[PDB]
Design a protein around this ligand. Sequence first.
Ligand SMILES: CCCCCCCCCCCCCCCCCC(=O)OC[C@H](COP(=O)([O-])OCC(O)COP(=O)([O-])OC[C@@H](COC(=O)CCCCCCCCCCCCCCCCC)OC(=O)CCCCCCCCCCCCCCCCC)OC(=O)CCCCCCCCCCCCCCCCC
Ligand SMILES: CCCCCCCCCCCCCCCCCC(=O)OC[C@H](COP(=O)([O-])OCC(O)COP(=O)([O-])OC[C@@H](COC(=O)CCCCCCCCCCCCCCCCC)OC(=O)CCCCCCCCCCCCCCCCC)OC(=O)CCCCCCCCCCCCCCCCC
Ligand SMILES: CCCCCCCCCCCCCCCCC[C@@H](O)O[C@H](CO[C@H](O)CCCCCCCCCCCCCCC)COP(=O)(O)OCC[N+](C)(C)C
Ligand SMILES: CCCCCCCCCCCCCCCCC[C@@H](O)O[C@H](CO[C@H](O)CCCCCCCCCCCCCCC)COP(=O)(O)OCC[N+](C)(C)C
Ligand SMILES: CCCCCCCCCCCCCCCCC[C@@H](O)O[C@H](CO[C@H](O)CCCCCCCCCCCCCCC)COP(=O)(O)OCC[N+](C)(C)C
Ligand SMILES: CCCCCCCCCCCCCCCCC[C@@H](O)O[C@H](CO[C@H](O)CCCCCCCCCCCCCCC)COP(=O)(O)OCC[N+](C)(C)C
Ligand SMILES: CCCCCCCC/C=C\CCCCCCCC(=O)O[C@H](COC(=O)CCCCCCC/C=C/CCCCCCCC)COP(=O)(O)OCCN
Lengths: 55, 122, 459, 347, 53, 69, 104, 56, 140
Amino acid sequence: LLDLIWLETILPKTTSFIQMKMSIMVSNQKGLIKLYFLSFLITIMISMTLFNYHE
Amino acid sequence: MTMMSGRPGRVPLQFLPNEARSLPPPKLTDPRLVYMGFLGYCSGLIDNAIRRRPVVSAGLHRQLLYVTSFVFFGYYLLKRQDYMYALRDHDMFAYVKSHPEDFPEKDKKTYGEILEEFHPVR
Amino acid sequence: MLKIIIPTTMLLPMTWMSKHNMIWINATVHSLLISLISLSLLNQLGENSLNFSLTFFSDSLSAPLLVLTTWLLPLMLMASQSHLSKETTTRKKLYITMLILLQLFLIMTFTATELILFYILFEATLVPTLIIITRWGNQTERLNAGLYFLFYTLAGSLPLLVALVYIQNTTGSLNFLIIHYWSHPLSNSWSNIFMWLACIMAFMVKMPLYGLHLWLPKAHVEAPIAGSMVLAAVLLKLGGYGMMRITTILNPLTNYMAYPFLMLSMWGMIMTSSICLRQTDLKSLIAYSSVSHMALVIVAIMIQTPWSFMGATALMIAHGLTSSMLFCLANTNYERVHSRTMILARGLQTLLPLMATWWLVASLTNLALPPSINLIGELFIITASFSWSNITIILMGMNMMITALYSLYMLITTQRGKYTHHINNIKPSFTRENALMALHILPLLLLTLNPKMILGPLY
Amino acid sequence: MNPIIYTTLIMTVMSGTMLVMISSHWLLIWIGFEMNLLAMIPVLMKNFNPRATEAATKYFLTQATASMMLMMAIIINLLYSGQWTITKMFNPVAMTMMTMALAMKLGLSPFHFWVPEVTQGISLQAGLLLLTWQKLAPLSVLCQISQSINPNLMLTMAMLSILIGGWGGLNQTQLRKIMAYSSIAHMGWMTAVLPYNTTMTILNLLIYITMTLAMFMLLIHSSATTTLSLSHTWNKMPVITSLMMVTLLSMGGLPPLSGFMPKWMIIQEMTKNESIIMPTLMAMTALLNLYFYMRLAYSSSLTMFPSTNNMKMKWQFEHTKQMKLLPTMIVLSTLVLPMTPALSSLN
Amino acid sequence: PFFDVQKRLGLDLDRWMTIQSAEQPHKIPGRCHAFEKEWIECAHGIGGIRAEK
Amino acid sequence: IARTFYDGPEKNYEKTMAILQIEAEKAELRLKELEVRRLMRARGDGPWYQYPTIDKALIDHSPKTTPDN
Amino acid sequence: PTIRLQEDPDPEDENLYEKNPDSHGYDKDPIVDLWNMRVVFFFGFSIVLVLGSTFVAYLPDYRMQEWARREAERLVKYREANGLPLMESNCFDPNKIQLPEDED
Amino acid sequence: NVLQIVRDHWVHILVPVGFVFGCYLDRRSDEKLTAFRNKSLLFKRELRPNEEVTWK
Amino acid sequence: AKTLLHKYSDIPEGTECHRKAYASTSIGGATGLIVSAYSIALKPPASFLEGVARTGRYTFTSAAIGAIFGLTSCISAQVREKPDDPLNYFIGGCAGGLTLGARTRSYGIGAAACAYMGLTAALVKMGQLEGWQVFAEPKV
Ligand SMILES: CCCCCCCCCCCCCCCCCC(=O)OC[C@H](COP(=O)([O-])OCC(O)COP(=O)([O-])OC[C@@H](COC(=O)CCCCCCCCCCCCCCCCC)OC(=O)CCCCCCCCCCCCCCCCC)OC(=O)CCCCCCCCCCCCCCCCC
Ligand SMILES: CCCCCCCCCCCCCCCCCC(=O)OC[C@H](COP(=O)([O-])OCC(O)COP(=O)([O-])OC[C@@H](COC(=O)CCCCCCCCCCCCCCCCC)OC(=O)CCCCCCCCCCCCCCCCC)OC(=O)CCCCCCCCCCCCCCCCC
Ligand SMILES: CCCCCCCCCCCCCCCCC[C@@H](O)O[C@H](CO[C@H](O)CCCCCCCCCCCCCCC)COP(=O)(O)OCC[N+](C)(C)C
Ligand SMILES: CCCCCCCCCCCCCCCCC[C@@H](O)O[C@H](CO[C@H](O)CCCCCCCCCCCCCCC)COP(=O)(O)OCC[N+](C)(C)C
Ligand SMILES: CCCCCCCCCCCCCCCCC[C@@H](O)O[C@H](CO[C@H](O)CCCCCCCCCCCCCCC)COP(=O)(O)OCC[N+](C)(C)C
Ligand SMILES: CCCCCCCCCCCCCCCCC[C@@H](O)O[C@H](CO[C@H](O)CCCCCCCCCCCCCCC)COP(=O)(O)OCC[N+](C)(C)C
Ligand SMILES: CCCCCCCC/C=C\CCCCCCCC(=O)O[C@H](COC(=O)CCCCCCC/C=C/CCCCCCCC)COP(=O)(O)OCCN
């Protein structure tokens, strides 16, 4: 219950699962430049509003 | 973020100013030079290994050139590094001397007259 | 101190320029000679340490650990040459090179004056161990074991590095002598609490503390014999030594920051001893016994008393010797029958009597029979803990019972009863194996005659 | 491509970078960037195929958008101060636009999307050039305007680059995409310390370039672009796989290897500025890069994968072309930690 | 980063075009020649940090 | 054994004193160096953090077709 | 082929006793084996254990324990010859301590 | 007769030479830490009529 | 914008719980809108109505988390009469994590989020109290 299951569950297995899910989310881009450049426009607007308005 | 590039009187691409000649040059048995020569020797051994040659015996002239090049570059590298550290300390001392109000000399108390809190271990 | 370091470095070209059939002989002879030379560091002063230079210094805490490392190298070489016989010449030399590099890093780690140098060598010890485990381990799990061995350590040690550099920005130095003389109390603040955690958790992971210990059974079980020997005998102690150095800047915070770790150590000591009672794998039992002994060491370091520090030093040395011997004993039977299941090969006292005697002596030192130094350390720690709080005896005594219960259990399972009928390839013990057991056991017994030599600076 | 034309194009790329790094006028820096891009496009398409054409098109679109933004920032700065000298931007809006343009040129998150694809679409030599030489000019410009950069935006982009590099590299079996995600993470590390100390940025750049050159040369030597192709190298050139494993350990930043020296120097520097949370997160995130380096080392050198029969024929032939600087590159990528104080020569 | 070749060699590749008060053809003045001249002479040699204040 | 393999306590004692002096001087130098860096970066009156301005020798001090500069 | 791969079968482990009935378990070559046994026994049991134990046993008293006993004897003699207390609760002389003047 | 045995046994002096070299380097390192030789308040002493240093 | 952060932080800890909850709701809604914008850009929803639905889902989830966190933390601060205590932020963050788990209808996500958000919020409170800097200015 403790060594083989829950101590595994909390520290190492949770870390592995979270990193794998984040890796899948980050790397699954279809390679279409339309989506990338739309995200670029969103980023440029955000940087102009949230950092450039605060100085 | 750029500390010493704009230091006054600095020539752009000298690598070794004239004033650096006022410093004692590193000895040829400097342990850092010996480590640089060791790096050159390791480069020669790896060059033998990659080319599928007898690692220790194949190129004695080539291994010698590796060691000599590493030592030759390391000498001037050590000279420049020592000069830069000497400049850092020179500027630090001059600035402390020119700003006495920012680095005051305060009277120091003895331990018999400083009250330190005692924390028992139990 | 260079009189130890330079011969160890010279071991590398010596093994790389030796004849194909001379590597083991040369390495063993010269590692034994290096151990003899290192034996001169045991002359310690009392008042202060032996400060060889700005970089290296020797203490009554460092010297026994250094001697144990230099003594463990020849035993590892002796234990490795049997299962590495079929290996090529180049890979055998590479294995010996890994062992030599590990010894060099450990020797420099135990004598570094400055905490960043200690940290760098402390991390450098990781690479040879990882290569040994993942290249010369036998099973497919070794790879996973390697990962567990790596990221548990780094996830603890990366914060420590940050703390260390932070300290040098405010104190101005990380030299241990300066740190000790100019030490100042830690106030009660959240920043101080997190700096305490960053300073402690890496050594906690290395011990390992109960709850952060899952890497140890994997790594010790999947490793080859020399890997297991060095992992249990020396590498774990890297935590303890580290703690004994860094608690000098953590007062008086440790007065209350230590409660969760003390609770974890005592309860998990009970837990791991109990785990040893139901274990099918013989190496796993030894690994969990190491976890329990290291929990006792953690308690000793956390309560911060001279008796506890002395007990922790003695227990570290004694456990290193005993656990290395137990791993070698298990490996002899593994090489006999190619399985680590404890109940497969039974009644071995009938077939291997002298090895049975070795098993018995190792089991006796594991359960801390007087007047062995195992019990000297254990009793000192228990007395200090009783002074800390009288209820601790309840847990401590319980641990003692369970320890004996599993130790003899192992002894009864593998040595007594009747032999397994179908196992007919159990050859007589080789002189190499008997000599390895003797070279483990005799120094341990001789240390009883001069216990102070392992009792540490607080003696 | 004709070898003379190839040499001319390479020297034009280098000349654009040198023009960027020797100019005091914003227009000449812009011209250097244009010249670099113009000569760089054909180098990506040297080996003609649909993938190379797609990679070149994506690269050109990204860099041309970045160049438009950069010229816009220059013009805004000129409008609010009749200045052409690259000292310190006088308008914060112009500074934000310039920082975004330079981040897009470097491939820092969230403008990292193009870096893997392009690196996958070109040859290994083109990838070597793209991941080593193409970083010099924007980083030099960033170093020159370091005092003007807003720390929040730059640090946000750096942390995002480290996180995304680790996470994206975790998912890759192709070696060029692994190198690209490694590059993104290292760029984040470089740009994190830029507002505090440009010498640390230069040191990290040099170390990363050395290790990247070593890895690309080792991958060209053992002509492998996938993990499974690299798993055959032990049965033909074991020394190459051993050197690759050591270099991979160095890239992960493990001490006593060289790759540890930049991070060690950066975290420490950040602690001089009362920055603890960001260095702690940065190291704990670089653990991911170490993980996928370790996985590659497992598949390549620490274990032995099954091979093929025809490999026997390859046993009878040597490598025709020899790399002169590969041994020096490997030694510099691994054994230079004891020479750390020499970094003072970089300021 | 900035390899300052021009000052080392005294070449003047692009410095003739950086400021409004620098040697225009036929001595045609900029609209703000006096102001830029005053600001440049104020800020010369004291560093950017001191010049900003 | 003492005559053959070891020295007297004075050697270790005074070597410790020399080592401690060097280490303490390095610590105070490091603290002073950090303070000097902070002051120079804040005020800009030292040799460090000297960021370039426009060279005044680029100004043309000749009549400009118009009396008012 | 009902098979997945071309592989060598796993070989059986060979007994060093078969070709060398007195094989010491060090090496396949009998001469190397005998000399490895001899060097291990001589340099571990004869050199390190015995001579090292003798060396450690006769280490000079740098911990200064007999010195401390003699110093304690001198102090006890002097103090009980003159009626002084055998030990003082104050480790440092109060006359060189400067306490804060006011505690309220 | 000694040529070949030397050629196959010269690796046996590497570690003893390492030990001797390490001792020499320890002495050299000792030479750099004499700033307080015969200057500590506890061990300061008048020189003998013939000795030049109290330790080396 | 850090103006919303100031609007949240200008009001004292255990006072005006409704206004604290409103400010935190605004911050959460802004975060959810940014998340939905990036998600729609990088993963198109193949329909306009489905994109509007996804934006509403993300923004409502984030705004609900913000409201729950702010209201719970302010109420815990005023009832216990202990402002400047990180455990109020821990309770608020763990309630927000439970809200996230309920919104995604996952017990495991709920527990993990409760723990992690509580610890993060307590850490933010400690950083506010001790002056920890995320984006440190270049002092040296
Ligand atoms: C100096 C630096 C600054 C530079 C920037 C300055 C810019 C100034 C000029 C702006 C004027 C623009 C003039 C010409 C632009 C050319 C556009 C174009 O060619 O379209 C091609 C593009 C692709 O054309 P296509 O491939 O032939 O057609 C494919 C089908 O359309 C699609 O086929 P499907 O059925 O397969 O797809 C399903 C459907 C799916 O459609 C959707 O899912 C979108 C619906 C989302 C619902 C939003 C929630 C509603 C409430 C939000 C309000 C926020 C406050 C509320 C507070 C709480 C409320 C209680 O369509 C999509 O997937 C398209 C997704 C892209 C939507 C718009 C992209 C913007 C960023 C993405 C976030 C979207 C909003 C999320 C919420 C964020 C906050 C608003 O067309 C479109 O994507 C849609 C039409 C675009 C027309 C409007 C463009 C104007 C917006 C420009 C920027 C906005 C302001 C900038 C800054 C303002 C402040 C400073
Ligand atoms: C280092 C050394 C060793 C240490 C490490 C090792 C130990 C550490 C870890 C050990 C295990 C802890 C894991 C935490 C919870 C994991 C849940 C999970 O895995 O979800 C995935 C899993 C997958 O679910 P799914 O896929 O979404 O749907 C399928 C379900 O199976 C379908 O489910 P269903 O339809 O069958 O029914 C589900 C439903 C109903 O569930 C049931 O059907 C059965 C009823 C279960 C509730 C039992 C309550 C009655 C007994 C509890 C008594 C009071 C607590 C103890 C107080 C002691 C007093 C002296 O659940 C609920 O509605 C429960 C909601 C909340 C009630 C319980 C929460 C209480 C929190 C504890 C507060 C403690 C404060 C500090 C106290 C200090 C003073 C001592 O969810 C579950 O199935 C588990 C549901 C039960 C959750 C509550 C159980 C937690 C027990 C206490 C946790 C506190 C420990 C951690 C403290 C640190 C946190 C900040
Ligand atoms: C992996 C380890 C790093 C390897 C790096 C590559 C090694 C080969 C490089 C070949 C050396 C020749 C380069 C310089 C020779 C003469 C040119 C010289 O005049 O340039 C000077 C510059 O000197 C060079 O920077 C010195 C280069 C030495 C680099 C060594 C530092 C490595 C860090 C420590 C690791 C140990 C490395 C071991 C060496 C093998 C001009 O200074 P300055 O124009 O005002 O600076 C411009 C940038 N500023 C103004 C923004 C600051
Ligand atoms: C698997 C094993 C892993 C290793 C486990 C390591 C254990 C580390 C635990 C650290 C022990 C104590 C940490 C800090 C000391 C006190 C903590 C707190 O609970 O005490 C109260 C603190 O008050 C509140 O409780 C605030 C803390 C509550 C918020 C923190 C979240 C705790 C939830 C549990 C998270 C799980 C942690 C481990 C994750 C793996 C005391 O109140 P007060 O005297 O006024 O404040 C003292 C601090 N001052 C002086 C700076 C002001
Ligand atoms: C009467 C019978 C009983 C006597 C028992 C005596 C016990 C001692 C025997 C054990 C040997 C001790 C172990 C050696 C460790 C010492 C290492 C070091 O401390 O010694 C150095 C000195 O080097 C010594 O020479 C050590 C040499 C020991 C080498 C051991 C090799 C023995 C192996 C046996 C091989 C035999 C032949 C093999 C055949 C195959 C010190 O360096 P140095 O800074 O200068 O000295 C400072 C003090 N000064 C200034 C006064 C000079
Ligand atoms: C197998 C056959 C069995 C049957 C035959 C048995 C024959 C008899 C066997 C039993 C003999 C019992 C002897 C009991 C001991 C008597 C002598 C003992 O008291 O010597 C001690 C001395 O022991 C040594 O001090 C300790 C030995 C330490 C051994 C170290 C071994 C070298 C290291 C090896 C590697 C270790 C690696 C790990 C290290 C941490 C006393 O020291 P001390 O009373 O004070 O000295 C006072 C007088 N002095 C100072 C002049 C000496
Ligand atoms: C095997 C797994 C082990 C996991 C270990 C993780 C815990 C490590 C301990 C914390 C790591 C980072 C601490 C930073 C180093 C401390 C140095 C320091 O003193 O900085 C503090 C700053 O302290 C912090 O900022 C640290 C806050 C935490 C940031 C990262 C949060 C990660 C999660 C926190 C809880 C986990 C830590 C304990 C885990 C125990 C092991 C499981 C004060 O500096 P100033 O800014 O100048 O303030 C002075 C005025 N008061």
